[PDB]
Design an enzyme around this catalytic site. Structure first.
Site, short mmCIF file in Angstrom:
data_model
loop_
_atom_site.label_atom_id
_atom_site.label_comp_id
_atom_site.label_asym_id
_atom_site.label_seq_id
_atom_site.Cartn_x
_atom_site.Cartn_y
_atom_site.Cartn_z
CB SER A 1 9.78 33.55 53.22
OG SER A 1 8.53 33.35 53.88
CE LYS B 1 9.63 36.62 56.73
NZ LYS B 1 8.81 35.82 55.77
CB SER C 1 10.26 32.40 57.46
OG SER C 1 11.40 32.20 56.64
NE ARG D 1 12.61 24.96 51.68
CZ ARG D 1 12.08 25.74 52.62
NH1 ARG D 1 11.42 26.84 52.28
NH2 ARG D 1 12.22 25.42 53.90
#
Ligand SMILES: [Cl-]
Lengths: 242, 242
Positions: free
Chosen positions: B47, B50, B95, B227
């Site tokens: 993602s 994007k 997302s 993350r």
């Protein structure tokens, strides 16, 4: 329309102060406030004027973009954050008056006046110092008039370039998380009575936008933090933010 | 120049995971990482793609602006936030793969390829399905290659309109307070081993910007929060944020 909700008045007296909060639901086209009277009282904009000044400075080329640096003029002032170089983003973050006073001088009496007319901004009166009229001059604006001007900026409907309005909205960025985004500007009127503090802007949500404009009695600088605290306490009450 | 700092590996092992964090000080033009190796190992972007996908969709007119709504196709998916209408801001916030899959189909195989070559993005290879090549196709990008792409976006140097890059940088807004602003995008690659989580972006300061890109082993989705958490502990260690 407009609904009055005097329950919000608590948040003001809980700090032994008085003021108004004005919200506007953009999707439903409905306004809410605790004091319909004071919602329309026009005050000096003080540093909230840095919004239109930025737009005008950008649109006329006084400011090329948000990266151009404006060197400290070397005069030590009582506000520490002012005694350093700045760009548009930092100048607005710390409400650096001397930077925007230079913007006004380069804008000029003539161009500044026409632009505030195009903006339908407050009383459209810039009498006083071209470089300080928003602090001790004749310009006046109410909370609801702030809301109306901000809505135009949001929809890029003001008569300046779309690029100019985006940059200012970038510089208005104040808070952002997984729940909301706040683009706003503070103000502190002191040179002329009555002393008040401003906070105007809007709260961005996934599928709606809430514009807000507030002013409160600010006798001393000890209560400047209440400009945001009270407003946020109202926002949470109305379940606009957690 | 590039310095390795193996002490950051603690932040990975204190959550008993393995990965790389790559920082870049734009003012000093210096890089820092805990593993110069994995820093250059290329993975599926997932993602994080994007960002470039948005740029191409905006620049070619597939997306008119950040307000254009892309209605839910009516197909119920396991991600609740996907079963609703979206714009660019919310599609990137949550997302929403189905929205950007439609972008890719409208961008097309040919134009997508030329744009990624102009961007110098990853290996520039779109082999596979136009609507999923960033998930299980042939495109690959390393952490250090993310930094190079993001740095170009910051300075509006990519070969798309300045407006296109500004809007994308708006949609990348993730966090903002009185200390810093974070513009970033997450990623979760699962269709091909190794399963990893991405986080790439940058931290805006008053007088500096720190670009960052990290990936970590993600056996299950239970550790997706790491993350951002691990990255921020590195940021805090380096005194980039409080
Ligand atoms: Cl922004």
């Amino acid at each position: 329309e407009w609904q009055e909700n005097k329950s919000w008045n608590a948040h003001f007296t809980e700090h032994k102060s008085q003021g108004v909060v004005v919200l506007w639901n953009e999707n439903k086209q409905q306004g809410f406030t605790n004091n319909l009277k004071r919602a329309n009282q026009a005050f000096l904009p003080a540093s909230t004027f840095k919004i239109p000044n930025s737009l005008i400075a950008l649109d006329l080329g006084v400011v090329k973009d948000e990266h151009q640096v404006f060197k400290w003029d070397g005069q030590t002032r009582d506000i520490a954050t002012w005694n350093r170089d700045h760009n548009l983003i930092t100048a607005m973050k710390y409400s650096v008056v001397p930077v925007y006073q230079e913007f006004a001088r380069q804008i000029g009496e003539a161009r500044m006046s026409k632009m505030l007319h195009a903006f339908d901004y407050g009383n459209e009166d810039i009498s006083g110092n071209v470089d300080s009229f928003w602090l001790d001059g004749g310009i006046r604006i109410s909370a609801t008039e702030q809301i109306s001007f901000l809505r135009k900026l949001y929809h890029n409907k003001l008569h300046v370039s779309e690029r100019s309005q985006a940059i200012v909205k970038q510089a208005m960025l104040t808070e952002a998380n997984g729940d909301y985004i706040i683009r706003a500007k503070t103000g502190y009127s002191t040179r002329i009575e009555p002393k008040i503090g401003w906070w105007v802007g809007w709260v961005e949500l996934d599928d709606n936008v809430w514009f807000f404009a507030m002013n409160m009695d600010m006798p001393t600088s000890d209560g400047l933090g209440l400009r945001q605290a009270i407003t946020k306490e109202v926002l949470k009450q109305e379940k606009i933010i957690p």
